[PDB]
UniProtKB/Swiss-Prot annotation, chain B:
Component of the elongator complex which is required for multiple tRNA modifications, including mcm5U (5-methoxycarbonylmethyl uridine), mcm5s2U (5-methoxycarbonylmethyl-2-thiouridine), and ncm5U (5-carbamoylmethyl uridine). The elongator complex catalyzes formation of carboxymethyluridine in the wobble base at position 34 in tRNAs. It functions as a gamma-toxin target (TOT); disruption of the complex confers resistance to Kluyveromyces lactis toxin zymocin (pGKL1 killer toxin). May also be involved in sensitivity to Pichia inositovora toxin. Pathway: tRNA modification; 5-methoxycarbonylmethyl-2-thiouridine-tRNA biosynthesis. Keywords: Cytoplasm, Nucleus, tRNA processing. GO terms for biological process: protein urmylation; regulation of transcription by RNA polymerase II; regulation of translation; tRNA wobble uridine modification. The keyword Zinc does not apply. InterPro entries: ELP6, P-loop_NTPase. It comes from Saccharomyces cerevisiae (strain ATCC 204508 / S288c) (Baker's yeast). CDD domains: Elp456. Signal peptide: none annotated. This is Elongator complex protein 6. GO terms for cellular component: cytoplasm; elongator holoenzyme complex; nucleoplasm. Belongs to the ELP6 family. Its main location: cytoplasm. Coiled coil: none annotated.
Swiss-Prot record, chain C:
Its main location: cytoplasm. Changing K196A: Abolished tRNA modification. [4Fe-4S] cluster binds at C15, C25, C28. The chain holds residues 94 to 557 of 557 of the full protein. Catalytic tRNA acetyltransferase subunit of the elongator complex which is required for multiple tRNA modifications, including mcm5U (5-methoxycarbonylmethyl uridine), mcm5s2U (5-methoxycarbonylmethyl-2-thiouridine), and ncm5U (5-carbamoylmethyl uridine). In the elongator complex, acts as a tRNA uridine(34) acetyltransferase, which mediates formation of carboxymethyluridine in the wobble base at position 34 in tRNAs. The complex functions as a gamma-toxin target (TOT); disruption of the complex confers resistance to Kluyveromyces lactis toxin zymocin (pGKL1 killer toxin). The lineage of its organism: Eukaryota, Fungi, Dikarya, Ascomycota, Saccharomycotina. It comes from Saccharomyces cerevisiae (strain ATCC 204508 / S288c) (Baker's yeast). GO terms for cellular component: cytoplasm; elongator holoenzyme complex; nucleoplasm; nucleus. This is Elongator complex protein 3. Changing R176A: Decreased tRNA modification.
Swiss-Prot record, chain D:
It comes from the Eukaryota. It is found in: Cytoplasm; Nucleus. The gene is ELP2. Component of the elongator complex which consists of ELP1/IKI3, ELP2, ELP3, ELP4, ELP5/IKI1 and ELP6. The elongator complex is composed of two copies of the Elp123 subcomplex (composed of ELP1/IKI3, ELP2 and ELP3) and two copies of the Elp456 subcomplex (composed of ELP4, ELP5/IKI1 and ELP6). The Elp123 subcomplex forms a two-lobed scaffold, which binds the Elp456 subcomplex asymmetrically. In the complex, ELP2 interacts with ELP1/IKI3. In each lobe, ELP2 is tightly sandwiched between ELP1/IKI3 and ELP3. It comes from Saccharomyces cerevisiae (strain ATCC 204508 / S288c) (Baker's yeast). The chain holds residues 227 to 338 of 788 of the full protein. This is Elongator complex protein 2. Folds into a two seven-bladed beta-propeller structure which is required for elongator complex assembly and association with microtubules.
Curated annotation (Swiss-Prot), chain E:
It comes from the Eukaryota. Belongs to the ELP5 family. The keyword Metal-binding does not apply. GO terms for molecular function: identical protein binding. This is Elongator complex protein 5. Pathway: tRNA modification; 5-methoxycarbonylmethyl-2-thiouridine-tRNA biosynthesis. Component of the elongator complex, which consists of ELP1/IKI3, ELP2, ELP3, ELP4, ELP5/IKI1 and ELP6. The elongator complex is composed of two copies of the Elp123 subcomplex (composed of ELP1/IKI3, ELP2 and ELP3) and two copies of the Elp456 subcomplex (composed of ELP4, ELP5/IKI1 and ELP6). The Elp123 subcomplex forms a two-lobed scaffold, which binds the Elp456 subcomplex asymmetrically. In each lobe, ELP2 is tightly sandwiched between ELP1/IKI3 and ELP3. The Elp123 subcomplex binds tRNA through ELP1/IKI3 and ELP3 and can bind 2 tRNAs simultaneously. The chain holds residues 2 to 233 of 309 of the full protein. It comes from Saccharomyces cerevisiae (strain ATCC 204508 / S288c). Present with 3870 molecules/cell in log phase SD medium. The gene is IKI1.
Amino acid sequence: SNEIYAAINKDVLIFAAVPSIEEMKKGKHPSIVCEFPKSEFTSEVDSLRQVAFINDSIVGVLLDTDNLSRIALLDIQDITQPTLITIVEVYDKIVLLRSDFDYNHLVYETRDGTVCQLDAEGQLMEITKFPQLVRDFRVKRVHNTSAEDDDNWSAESSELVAFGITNNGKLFANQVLLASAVTSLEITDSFLLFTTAQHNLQFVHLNSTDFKPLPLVEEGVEDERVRAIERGSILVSVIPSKSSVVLQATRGNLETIYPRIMVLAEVRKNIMAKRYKEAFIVCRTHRINLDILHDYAPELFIENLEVFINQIGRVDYLNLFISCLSEDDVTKTKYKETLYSGISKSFGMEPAPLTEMQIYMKKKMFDPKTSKVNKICDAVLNVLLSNPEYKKKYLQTIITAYASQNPQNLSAALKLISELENSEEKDSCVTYLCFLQDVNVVYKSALSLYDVSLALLVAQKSQMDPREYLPFLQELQDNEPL
Amino acid sequence: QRQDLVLFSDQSVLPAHFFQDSNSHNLFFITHQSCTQPLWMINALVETHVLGSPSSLNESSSSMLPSSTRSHAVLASFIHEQNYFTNSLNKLKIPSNNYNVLDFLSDFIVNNIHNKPRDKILSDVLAKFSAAIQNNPTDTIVIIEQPELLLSLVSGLTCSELNNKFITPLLRQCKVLIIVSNSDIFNIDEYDASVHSSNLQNFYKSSFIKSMINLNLNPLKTGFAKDVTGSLHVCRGGAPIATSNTSLHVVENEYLYLNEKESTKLFYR
Amino acid sequence: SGIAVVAVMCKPHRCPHIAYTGNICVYCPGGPDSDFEYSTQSYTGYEPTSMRAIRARYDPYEQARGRVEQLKQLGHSIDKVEYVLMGGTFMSLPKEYREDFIVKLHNALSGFNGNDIDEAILYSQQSLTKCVGITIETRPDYCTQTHLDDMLKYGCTRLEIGVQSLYEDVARDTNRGHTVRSVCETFAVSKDAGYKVVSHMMPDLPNVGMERDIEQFKEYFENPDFRTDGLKIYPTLVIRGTGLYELWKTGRYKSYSANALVDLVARILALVPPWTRIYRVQRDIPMPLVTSGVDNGNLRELALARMKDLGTTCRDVRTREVGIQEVHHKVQPDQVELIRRDYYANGGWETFLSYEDPKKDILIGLLRLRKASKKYTYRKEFTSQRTSIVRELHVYGSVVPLHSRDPRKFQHQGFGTLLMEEAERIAKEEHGSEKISVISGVGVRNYYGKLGYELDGPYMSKRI
Amino acid sequence: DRYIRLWRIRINDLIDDSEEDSKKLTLLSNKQYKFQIDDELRVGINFEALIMGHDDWISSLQWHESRLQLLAATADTSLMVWEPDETSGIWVCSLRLGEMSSKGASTATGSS
Amino acid sequence: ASSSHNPVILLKRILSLTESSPFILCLDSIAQTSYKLIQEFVHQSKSKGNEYPIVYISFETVNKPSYCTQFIDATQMDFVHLVKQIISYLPAATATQAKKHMVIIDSLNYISTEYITRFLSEIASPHCTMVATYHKDIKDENRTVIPDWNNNYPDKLTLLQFMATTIVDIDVVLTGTLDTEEVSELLNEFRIPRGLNNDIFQLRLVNKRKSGRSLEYDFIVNSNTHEYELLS
Ligand code: SF4
């Protein structure tokens, strides 16, 4: 819970504690409370080297003789001398020691290359042996589920997996070889990160068991398997709550970056809960394509557009997003689910843009009933045009919907403009419509809707000759309507 | 910083089963720019064949004396002499008794090759190795060093006769052959050897066609630095691998190497 | 667009640090005492700006007006100009001269014809042809708090204080009047005021080896004291009139060859932190009068070939800039991300935010933020509570095209707002500040007055 | 901006009309500024003409007594006299004084 | 006309010896060696079932080819012998109704030009199919010929291009960061960079017909699955 800390001096152990995280964020300096001598529970045995914690209530210590390396355990208490619990007798020497992935038990390594796990009440069970002596290792609970991208909901049982890296820098699974030379590794929920000797940040999604060696390093990934990072930069910490990774540079300054995969996971999670405001902010502030809002689930949007409109009260936000629309599947070119589906495949092969002459077949293919843009426009139009109050709040949205088609209904836009009680408001609408489209065609439509004021008001911005619009209206303004 | 030296898919430089397969042959071709010398690689090859590991780069060299080992090694050269080979390679501690060393420089020039028919010279220079390898037939490695110089020695010899009289019989008789040479002929500034000096270059091109692996030691570009000496290239030769296993192939990578006090270091850019 | 740099000149004078050492610093060429004698120090008087200054008898009004009109007539139209001053130590001169100089330089563009500099700057705020700051050259001995207040009132935005070395014998043997360590406190006091600070270096100097040259730069970039926002590298060239030529005449001096210098530059460029802008390794020199050294017109043109042969190419701002609009938009860019770095420099924590492409390492926009400390701040604005300062806003993100679905007809006009709100987020959450301030030139005091910042003294600030 | 413009002003009973209640084409730049000053006086102001053709910023405009002429001084020391054009309706400069080339006390090129 | 309406079909008919070809020539270099095309012959000409004696006459090769059924070493024979100890294995110009075999020559660069045409005269029969590769990076020996002003005759390349009825050129497809200019340069000073000698290669086909002009096309050939793609 990040409120208890233990430090070992010689012959005494010191425990410090804080009331809460918020108090530390307020300005309460950490308070030292517990001071426990050595002769109380050990009687001056040789060594005092390491220490570890279990779920805020168990503290483990290593006491080493010439060859025997006992592990002392204490169930914590208050300031008054936390009592001793059974210390075990071990017949080997310990090298490394950590906690487990959820702060429940302890894991440790012997001087031969064997990792074993022990429980908080003297329950012992051996785990694994390593193919080569290592300098670092990490124990992780791999879910034993069967789905390749974990699309199950029964939450099947899990198994303990302990990785490792040698002094030469070769990343190892339990018994699986990985990239030849690396220098770092960090594991969190379903996530593994490691930096090779070429210093590329490479990701691993923990799906299930049966690991295999990773492929030869290649150039570029469409998914988030491979990212380029500065030289000498080892990893420091991972914060998936904000989709961030923090690392240490070689000269001694911090750095923090946000790889695309964890941001995409966050936005997908926000989508699943029918929350269309936080996802918008996340997708915008990190320069993520806005089509992914519902391009990954069209039917949900077709049924939830009525609340999509209500959740986002900013007119400009809606205008931006609807103008931010394309037709392709952003789920297949930018944000493929191959971020975590499949293992041991070929890499991204950084794509190239299409040659221009071979795109026009799609242009000639276009009909209103095929494109996503037209169906989205019709949906939002019929949703908004069912209440005059909503029109008088998103006229800009309606104009954008009209102008977001190949068969643009600019005539309807000018019809909607005509009914305003104001002149400068009509001017603002005219300017907005001129932003998206050429003034020439707008003037053509203004002529085609049989009115005189609108034509000249559009022609003001036409930047054409005075003689283009003087005599035409000077004749039109006078005669009979027929 | 330091990186391992791997030259095959089996994560081994010199596979042992190569010596265990009968009815097979293989050829390695090594080229060094004559501003540097590949001796520190010949040593590694010999150690990894005999001791089974690179005993100077990746492994310590405190027990480097492979004399009287179950394996064998045969080296022959023209550029230097028997005296240099013994004194130096024993100061480099390259074995002696489970080993064969051949000179063709000291006292060989003086009317032992000169003013004699060419056919006898070629026959005898072939018979030297044809008799020196009869003892141990299937646990030896043989390396020749810069044999093209002999072309300039024999009165009027082209690439074809020398090749078919010396090189191919040697590889047919022996299991595996390693040929090392230098490439200054391709590095004359503002002069074209393709004008009339193509006879020697024919040998290089023929060897690269016949070779299986190609090792290149080349100097740095425009300038000269302190922390790095040269560049190391590995490439697939012309001929295919004559092994019996199917998954075998060659790894493809480039190294930067520094040499200092017989100690070599390899790493990446 | 229309960014303009119009250099001006001040009347000749003598820097007083000569007084306690006897002469000018050894490498300084020319000067009033030299044969030229109508020229400010460190300039031979043969530069085109020197010619334009002499014919005007060293008057700021005429120089500024003439250069502006010439630039306008050439074919470019100007609406954003930044002034730079040159020559000696401008701050040494008496009180009235600097006031009149600044008032003239602002009234040249504003069109105003008054006095009482407060009114001049007040009118210059509401003027066309906006000014985007000044660049004043000054020495460590003249950066005291009173002078800093003067510069803040004038409208200056960034200084450039040279150090020329970090060893201690060089300071006395080059007749430069300041110990090296005092420059650190100068940087510390200057930075807390929001002044971007740039330095100078010269690789080869008398009684300096190639080694010492290497680790002096290494210590400059590594030590948390010599971390500054810019650099200039001046290879040592020997002009006949300098005190350097006497050493060569007496045989007490020798230079480097070409290979040594190109190797040194290649090594140096492979260490630059990614928040410092290497200004000019290929500086501008009086060519024919040099007697010792090597050609410097294309040093980097060969250093690049060197890094392509050793690896780890440069990472400065300049090489990674894409520009305001269509400089390298011939190809559609790649993945765009936000990168945030933090470092400790001169008794304080500072943050550098940027919008970059990580696959190919280009740069689009950047921002700098500093958390004010307690042992260096003295301004009555910054001595009332905790506060943070935006030392520089830089938006080349005025680019129309982009990668990852650029705005169609909005074309990144709200791009800067992203960074501004990003800065405000960590100002409110991490710094725990109660006031945020931004420094800027007087001509651009409105691009920041729309986001809510209100004016106090020379600063644009808003609370939390 | 180096341009000189004019504005005509009329009292009531002579103010230009047909702007209101008449089918005419109103341009963007020909707007008429009318104001009811008091219960008995209304003034109409309109734009007349654009005069240009100078090398720097205008500094002094002065009227006359017996002519429709103006005196224009620039920052280039040039002097111009602008007079009405009875033939083309757009005023053309009458006299141009100060062709001497002099900038400051020391003259190199141009004038100032 | 109504035959070989697709270039791929023509290539496969040539490869599998469906249509007889008295002479075929293949060009290669150091940038891409030419022993994969023999694999193409072996694989394609076995679908029709040609187990007929695949003689492999060799001048330089040290190893014995598994894919072939014969092995002849010609480092000790002269011209007349070399013709004579091949007519036995091959269906020599007797038995006017008989089968056809396969001939693989490892190298053409070791033979003097003076006999070239005769090596195609004493053996040319409707029973034999000569296949041989030509390395273009080896310049032959010309001191013996003494090319003075009165001792002249055409060079080997033109004779090889003339007496051939089908010509195929081999090239290595560029895949990574190497282009033709710098590749040819580095080969000139012999640095041999990575990005050479792969199985996926490219071919240029020139097929000659009687009483008419030949046809020239290009192909992309893979040596893994034995599949082809014509030039776009
Ligand atoms: S301080 Fe500047 S002006 Fe003074 S002598 Fe040194 S370089 Fe010249």
